[PDB]
Design a binder for these strands. Structure first.
Lengths: 93, 95, 583, 86, 107, 107, 93, 82, 98
DNA sequence: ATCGGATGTATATATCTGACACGTGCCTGGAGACTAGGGAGTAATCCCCTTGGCGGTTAAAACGCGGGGGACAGCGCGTACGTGCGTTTAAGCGGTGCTAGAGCTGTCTACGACCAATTGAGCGGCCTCGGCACCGGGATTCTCGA
DNA sequence: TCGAGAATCCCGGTGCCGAGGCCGCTCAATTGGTCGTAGACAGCTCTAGCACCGCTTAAACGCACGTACGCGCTGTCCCCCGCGTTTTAACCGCCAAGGGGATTACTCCCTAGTCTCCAGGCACGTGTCAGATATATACATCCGAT
């Protein structure tokens, strides 16, 4: 039985922002549970959107909207810019 | 002339009775649209929607004044004051 | 005394009337007397007193002053106002707008009267959703009219349109609706702007408290309501007594309407046709049933132990409402079934159990009246329990429902002997000439509703007597109200006297009526300060032959033993009666 | 196609009205300064809600804000409203 | 026939594959669009970048090289929009922002 | 081959069929057990019975034959456990419970 | 296009509790939206249960539990009794 | 197993400490009961929901995940335990 | 004349102490005995992972703390520096927790 | 003190009108019936983790207490806020009229589901050295009587 | 106001254990394929929202007037904070022993998926009646004067 987590991923990101900084185990468990949380929220919003408009399929456009609901203030603008760029490069390659 | 403060205590017993909407339509609508312009422009509202915003609004301020009143009474004053409200919105965590 | 003040008002009152353009001289200053009904009025001719009343109304606004007409029901008041109008259209060359107002049901009668008599004139009516009034309203807004006919309602609803337009003359009917100036209409008519001249009717002017004369009279001229408390002169004065309310009112009866002779008018049927054959005026006493005695006599403590005295506390006591809360009925029966002591508890029900059967044998069609609607429940269940053919009419009986109830009852062969009512509840106008027996119930605030109940029956065409038993129980609060409305009967009788010297504008008559009622007060005051099948058959006997069939009813019910009135022990019905009477 | 500029409509909420709301709440004696405080609070609240509603709308590519839009916005903010459909 | 990972194709640090699995196996809809798992992983990457950045800074300002929960607490709460977002979150071992009401101070 | 409705088979007033549809088409799980839609419809029936009962009573005590929102408001709020349940619900046209703090009263 | 609702159902229940009582239209729209609400809650709980225990299938037993979470106080005991009886009679017939 | 008055285990020193962390300056002597009341309530709710989840899973043990789902249920989201 | 601080100062040292560090402020064994004691009512004979008990403690302390924050806001609003039972009761009333 | 005027209040009226109820017809979503199989259920064996019992160490809780600073209650005052009346204006409503845009429908078509094969990344074991706890010791500073 | 003493920080040293870096290595990734269908998109209709007018009229507003309350002060009283010494009860370390989970392979039947086949629910209708408002009759309340 292998549990899963984002620990490795988080850690990579850390070494991208602060190459020198260790992250204690517990303080990883947080960031883990965090990411799972934000994921459950954003997904949940994608669902209860696609349900209303009677689409059957979560697409990007929903996820965009859902983000624009949950993330307050500037996290909206930045995050949206991020994802937009990401999918862009994705299709373009 | 009545003892000041009595006419109120008639008003309360009046308004806590009935259900009617306490804000004039046209002003409130003009307000709502005015706010709406910022986010997107050139919008349509079903009348019933505007009705909704009014309903939630009044039904919010009301509870607000209830709790505020609890605070002012806690302060041994009978008169609510801006600092009272500010306390309320602080306790609930609305801002 | 205040007569000279009244004279200064002879000058100044009619000064204000000059602004709105004895008293008798100066009130009649313009006399135009035409002794026939006009030309354009068609379909017959009015009676002497009728054309003289016409002529009277003419004399009113010849001098250009408003007024009242007190005439008794069924004396032709309708056709009278018709004639007055018509005379104002033709002989006065006025034409112009005329604002007439009625109660709804009567408006049919009115429309008919404009169909027969004056086809010559436009009569605008109103009913039937805003639709009909779109056409009709915009039709009037064009300036199209002769007569404009409507009810109380559409004065309020159309008050915009009607108020907005100029008018000539204003005809109120049933005018005692004006009784309280707090009534919406009374003030709306001032918000209504004005017809040039306003005019009123009544069957009966009303309570001796006399804002009524205030409300009406004041509403007759703006002068008058400016004069309200100069009425409070003799309205305070008239309202010892020989040297106070009599030696003064040996005139002041007059002197009030000795002033008001000219613009107020009246008549009586006994004066004009006097073809009313007869009817009897009787009362009875009853006993408070012991059950309705026990804790209910004590409801002074139940006043705190629950609603309100006069009705739910009081009138329940009076046999009127056995077990309206119904837990008392439960103390008798949960199943609400037929047995004794449910109906026995009341003088009403049991009493009828005694008296009615005799009538069932003598087949005299009975009338029954109330105020509180709900009595009619146990009344039915009682009648069915006796298996009696009866009809009731509630406040929920609709107009055409009413016509049906009438014609069925008024069918010649109708085998329903008793007919149930609640007086004011359905009273309106009605005619029952097929019923020979009237019986009255409970409090009936003010008599005038009782006079309604009576007018329902003895109206011309009723060829029997009319027996009347006002049903009262001994040692009962109903006696208080009864006597109260009885003193009302007195002083409003004095008011009838007002309508008397004022009625015929004669002298030996007016003094005959003076001495009349001033003697009546003496007698009545002097009188102020069991079932006995024999007695009952006596008060039920219009001949010793009724003493024959009624006493063969007493041959049987001689031998036969009649389910009586008193309910006498049942403890926990007492203590539990204190429970529920306290609950 | 009017040129649409709305300003100071927040004045449309009037000392009488706010006073009424206070009454319904059970307030007895207001303080004169509240009348601005309330306009502040209200304006905020509707900013949030109208925000979410508009967002739902644009997502559905509609030029209109239906009542259902609102009810979903309130439901989003944790204030559940009934009577307008769902 | 040589495989490249999607997370690379967009240049992301989060496993776009794993996301695209969780959406399906989580029953968040009938069908999962293709752009979605990407567009989501991007957002997550951004946010985690935000938190870890701030906690990194504060941790350095405590003269520590290794981030511990307290640092996360202070990073979140001190910032605004995060606090707006996490407001009901409770961080074990979190402690509290240093705070005292002014009137409590002696004078 | 004559059809009887499930809502009847359990003797319920709510359309057990319609429920069993909504569960599936709502993606609340992969598979819907058979007893479930029943067991749910029962509960709904019970609750709606509760509310409608109370609002009925209060409505009668206003001497009205026809239930209107105000009646629902008073029915809920006056009761406890419902208020516990609905606490964040807002009922349009709802009005407020009659209430005044004691100290506001004159003496 | 036919919208659906519980209006008829609600109305039946009403005539079971108070045979005499009308229910105004708006005041129906409430009870409607209400029932949809409680439904969404109870379903949602059934989901996020069956997810944890790694069952793939909502069954009765879950719905029971979910109810025992949401309904406060006695509404628990009564409601549970109700449903229990209902399914019982259901299978038994 | 009979446990009684363990709520005394929450002690005036401790509650006082919590107050301090909150930023309380001067306690009133009566609080010490009030707090025990509040706390006892809160844990009643949470332990309730957790136990419910457990029995549903047919386990005799309450895992941390149970709790975290209970808190999440009541609208208090906890991190760090999974 | 031994030395003593102005009363109320030692507190203002304690606050600056505790708002610093993260440690858990309730003794384990008492708190555990409490939790189990409550648990008995609902079901009997239960097992707790230690980490779970840790959770309940975490949420608990992390709750009372916020409670005392807000309460303190109330007491200050009352121009008193001392929180009182009626203050808390006000707090739990405003939030709507009971 | 009365007491007057405005407010409820118990039964009853008269009507007015728009909104609810019963309905007739129609359509498709639900029931009946059958089949496949996979999720679910249940033995069976294993062992990781909870619980109990222990004997120590001591930090921390309990208890006492003098004293002091906060609570709290009084209160004189002056002033902003209730009331209300007279004047104004903008809401409410009914109307007209236009049309942007909601809402539905028929094809389309890209495209996501499914599957089989391929394969590398991501996760369990498994070390290690250094970041960090901790201690003691002087340096500093911060409170509290002058 | 400086001075003393307790509080607290700093630095340097010490000792440890987990953050983290690798190593296999199973399996969940990714490629690479069809195919059935969600949903895009013209494309059409009509409806519900916007605009505007003119109208009663009920508000909103401005205002002067007075007094109830917010408040600043004060002084009385006391309940809580700052520090003893006492007592214990948590803590930590240690152990064993066993249940309760977890895993594992096995059977089987409940749900999904189709396929017809209706009658239950929905949409439009034309009606009756419940609320609405005005009226009739008392008495009782209340309150803000006397």
């Amino acid at each position: 039985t292998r549990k899963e987590s984002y620990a490795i991923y988080v850690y990579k990101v850390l070494k991208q922002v602060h190459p020198d900084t260790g992250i204690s185990s517990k303080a990883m468990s947080i960031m883990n549970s965090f990411v799972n949380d934000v994921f459950e929220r954003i997904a949940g919003e994608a669902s209860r959107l696609a349900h209303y408009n009677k689409r059957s399929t979560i697409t990007s456009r929903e996820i965009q909207t859902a983000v624009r609901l949950l993330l307050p203030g500037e996290l909206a603008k930045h995050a949206v810019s991020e994802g937009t760029k990401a999918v862009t490069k994705y299709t373009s390659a | 002339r009545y003892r000041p403060g009595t006419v109120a205590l008639r008003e309360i017993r009046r308004y806590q009775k009935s259900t009617e909407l306490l804000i004039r339509k046209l002003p409130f609508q003009r307000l709502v649209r005015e706010i709406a312009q910022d986010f997107k422009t050139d919008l349509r509202f079903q009348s019933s929607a505007v009705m909704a915003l009014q309903e939630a609004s009044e039904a919010y301020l009301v509870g607000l004044f209830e709790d505020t009143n609890l605070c002012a009474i806690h302060a041994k004053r009978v008169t609510i004051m801006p600092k009272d409200i500010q306390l309320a919105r602080r306790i609930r965590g609305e801002r | 005394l205040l007569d000279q003040t009244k004279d200064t008002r002879i000058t100044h009152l009619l000064r204000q009337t000059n602004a709105f353009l004895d008293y008798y001289n100066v009130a009649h200053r313009i006399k135009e007397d035409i002794k026939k009904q006009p030309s354009i009025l068609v379909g017959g001719t009015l009676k002497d007193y009728q054309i003289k009343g016409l002529q009277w109304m003419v004399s009113l606004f010849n001098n250009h002053l408003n007024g009242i007409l007190a005439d008794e029901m069924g004396l032709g008041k309708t056709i009278q106002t018709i004639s007055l109008l018509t005379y104002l259209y033709e002989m006065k060359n006025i034409r112009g707008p005329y604002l007439v107002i009625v109660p709804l049901s009567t408006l049919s009668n009115w429309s008919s009267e404009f169909a027969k008599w004056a086809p010559t004139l436009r009569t605008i009516s109103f009913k039937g959703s805003p639709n009909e009034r779109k056409a009709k309203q915009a039709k009037i807004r064009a300036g199209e009219f002769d007569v404009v006919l409507t009810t109380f309602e559409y004065i309020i609803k159309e008050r915009a349109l009607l108020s907005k337009v100029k008018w000539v003359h204003m005809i109120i009917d049933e005018g005692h609706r004006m009784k309280n100036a707090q009534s919406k209409l009374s003030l709306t008519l001032n918000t209504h702007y004005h017809a040039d001249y306003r005019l009123i009717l009544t069957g009966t002017p009303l309570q001796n408290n006399l804002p009524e004369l205030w409300a009406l009279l004041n509403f007759v001229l703006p002068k008058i309501f400016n004069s309200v408390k100069s009425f409070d002169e003799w309205f305070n004065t008239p309202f010892d007594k020989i040297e106070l309310s009599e030696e003064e009112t040996l005139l002041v009866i007059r002197r009030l309407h000795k002033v008001l002779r000219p613009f107020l008018l009246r008549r009586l049927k006994k004066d004009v046709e006097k073809e009313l054959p007869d009817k009897v005026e009787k009362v009875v006493k009853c006993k408070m049933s012991a059950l309705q005695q026990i804790m209910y006599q004590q409801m002074l403590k139940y006043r705190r132990l629950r609603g309100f005295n006069n009705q739910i506390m009081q009138l329940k006591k009076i046999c009127n409402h056995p077990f309206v809360f119904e837990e008392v009925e439960d103390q008798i029966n949960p199943t609400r079934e037929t047995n004794d002591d449910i109906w026995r508890v009341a003088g009403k029900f049991e009493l009828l159990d005694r008296i009615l059967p005799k009538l069932k044998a003598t087949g005299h069609r009975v009338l029954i009246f109330f105020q509180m609607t709900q009595i009619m429940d146990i009344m039915e269940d009682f009648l069915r329990y006796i298996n009696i053919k009866y009809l009731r009419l509630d406040g929920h009986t609709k107009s055409d429902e009413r016509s049906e109830l009438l014609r069925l009852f008024n069918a010649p062969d109708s085998e329903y002997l008793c007919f149930i009512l609640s007086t004011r509840a359905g009273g309106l106008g009605l005619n029952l000439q097929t019923a020979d027996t009237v019986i009255i119930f409970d409090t009936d605030w003010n008599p005038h509703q009782d006079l309604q109940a009576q007018d329902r029956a003895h109206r011309i065409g009723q060829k029997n007597e009319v027996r009347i038993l006002r049903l009262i129980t001994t040692n009962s609060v109903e006696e208080v109200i009864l006597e109260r409305a009885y003193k009302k009967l007195d002083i409003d009788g004095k008011v009838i006297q007002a309508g008397k010297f004022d009625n015929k504008s004669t002298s030996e008559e007016q003094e005959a009526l003076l001495r009349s009622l001033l003697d009546a007060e003496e007698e009545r005051r002097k009188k102020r300060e069991e079932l006995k099948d024999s007695e009952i058959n006596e008060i039920l006997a219009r001949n010793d032959e009724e003493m024959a069939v009624l006493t063969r009813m007493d041959e049987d019910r001689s031998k036969k033993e009649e389910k009586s009135r008193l309910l006498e022990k049942k403890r926990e019905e007492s203590e539990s009666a204190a429970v529920y009477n306290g609950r | 196609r009017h040129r649409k500029v709305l300003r100071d409509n927040i004045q449309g909420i009037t000392k009488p009205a706010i006073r009424r709301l206070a009454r319904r709440g059970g307030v007895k004696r207001i303080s004169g300064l509240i009348y601005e405080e309330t306009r502040g609070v209200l304006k905020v609240f509707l900013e949030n809600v109208i925000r979410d509603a508009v967002t739902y709308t644009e997502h559905a590519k509609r030029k209109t804000v239906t009542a259902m839009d609102v009810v979903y916005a309130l439901k989003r903010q944790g204030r559940t409203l009934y009577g307008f459909g769902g | 026939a040589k495989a490249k990972t999607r997370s690379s194709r967009a240049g992301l640090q989060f496993p776009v594959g794993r996301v695209h699995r969780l959406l399906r196996k989580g029953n968040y809809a009938e069908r999962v669009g293709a752009g979605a798992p990407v567009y989501l992983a991007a957002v997550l990457e951004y946010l985690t970048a935000e938190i870890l950045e701030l906690a990194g800074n504060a941790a350095r300002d405590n003269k520590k090289t290794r981030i511990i929960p307290r640092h996360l607490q202070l990073a979140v709460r001190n910032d605004e929009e995060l606090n707006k977002l996490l407001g009901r979150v409770t961080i074990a071992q979190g402690g509290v922002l240093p705070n005292i009401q002014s009137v409590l101070l002696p004078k």
